[PDB]
Amino acid sequence: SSVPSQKTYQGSYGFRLGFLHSGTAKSVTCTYSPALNKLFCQLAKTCPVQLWVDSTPPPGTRVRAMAIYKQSQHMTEVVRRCPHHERCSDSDGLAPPQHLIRVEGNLRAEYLDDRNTFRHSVVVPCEPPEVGSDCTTIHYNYMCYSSCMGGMNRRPILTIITLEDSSGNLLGRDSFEVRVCACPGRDRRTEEENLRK
Ligand SMILES: [Zn+2]
DSSP: OOOOOOOOBOTTTTOEEEOOOOOOOTTOSEEEETTTTEEEEOTTOOEEEEEEOSSOOOTTOEEEEEEEESSGGGTTSOOOOOTTGGGSSOOOSSSOTTOSEEESSOTTOEEEEOTTTOOEEEEEEOOOOOTTOSOEEEEEEEOSOTTOTTTTTTOOEEEEEEEEOTTOOEEEEEEEEEEEOSOHHHHHHHHHHHHHO
8 A cells, every 4th residue: 555654744723743841760651752753652551642723723623643663664554453452342432443543532534445545544624722722632542452463564664744734635644653561661761772783
């Protein structure tokens, strides 16, 4: 399948992602490494991602998330749940069982299977920040381990977040690598040490 662009693009509204500072304790379920631009998270745990804009986009703007393989030799392969997890009885009523990425706690989430590329994505309406806040947050879940056989199979993935208008045209784009693993704090520490070495 053709490969979606991963080029960072702030666009007219100054769109970019942000992440909370969670640390690398053994108790951490989700931690983001700025040095690696990489999120480490446990299976099906809440991953809060901040959406930042310099100016408010029009009503009907939406935010889409999609996973692609990071490595050149695999980026044409659709990222999907492995044969085991796609048959898990863990439906939330909205997400198709094949989709790796879910949005948690948003009843207006929509899930797309692209008719031409067959890629999966999940999209929600963009909303203005609440009273007293400067950004909005989306809660994502990753429903397969990076290591799952017959699925990601230890291959790294990227999540691409796109800001879109009501027709789906591109307004902004940002991305981050993801590792879904049992011990995100330990793995983030290891990979940051390797990068230093
Ligand atoms: Zn799996």
